[PDB]
């Protein structure tokens, strides 16, 4: 363990890290859904066209 | 062993590195497939021409 | 992938990730705010 972590605490941090990453991403996904509802991006080549 | 890793752990890193590379590349491939669908590049010499 | 935490210090990763994520979010918000379409304060001109 060059970092200096045992197996037990390395597994514990990894579980918390993934859960926090998933929770952060899920909130961001819904944020993008609401943002898309307010103002869609990725227009057609002719523009948004109202 | 100039790095300071054993043969066994070098194999394990190689497996994780290649698997991560494949996952990252495949996601990028689908992103380019979606990007091409939204807006193709590489136009003809006369332009995209709508 | 959990073996990465034996290679990198979790304390170092979290602070670097926190700064990286905040600057990235600050950059995206600024870019949108400087566009005409996605300016949510004064709106389109």
């Amino acid at each position: 363990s060059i970092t200096g972590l045992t197996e037990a605490e390395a597994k514990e941090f990894h579980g918390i890290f993934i859960t926090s990453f998933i929770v952060f991403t899920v909130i961001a996904i819904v944020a993008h859904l609401l943002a898309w509802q307010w103002r869609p991006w990725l227009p057609a080549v002719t523009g948004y066209g109202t | 062993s100039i790095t300071g890793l054993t043969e066994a752990e070098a194999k394990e890193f190689h497996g994780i590195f290649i698997t991560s590379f494949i996952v990252f590349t495949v996601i990028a491939i689908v992103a380019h497939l979606l990007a091409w669908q939204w807006r193709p590049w590489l136009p003809a010499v006369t332009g995209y021409g709508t | 992938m959990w073996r990465m935490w034996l290679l990198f210090d979790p304390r170092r990763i979290l602070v670097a990730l926190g700064v990286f994520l905040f600057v990235l979010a600050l950059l995206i918000h600024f870019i949108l705010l400087s566009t005409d379409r996605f300016n949510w304060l004064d709106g389109p001109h």
Partner: peptide
């Protein structure tokens, strides 16, 4: 064209989790 953003945002997130369980 929402599908473009959905993949580039969600699929990497699923990739991290799927690379993590192994």
């Amino acid at each position: 064209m929402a599908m473009v953003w959905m993949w580039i945002l969600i699929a990497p997130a699923i990739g991290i989790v799927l690379l993590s369980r192994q």
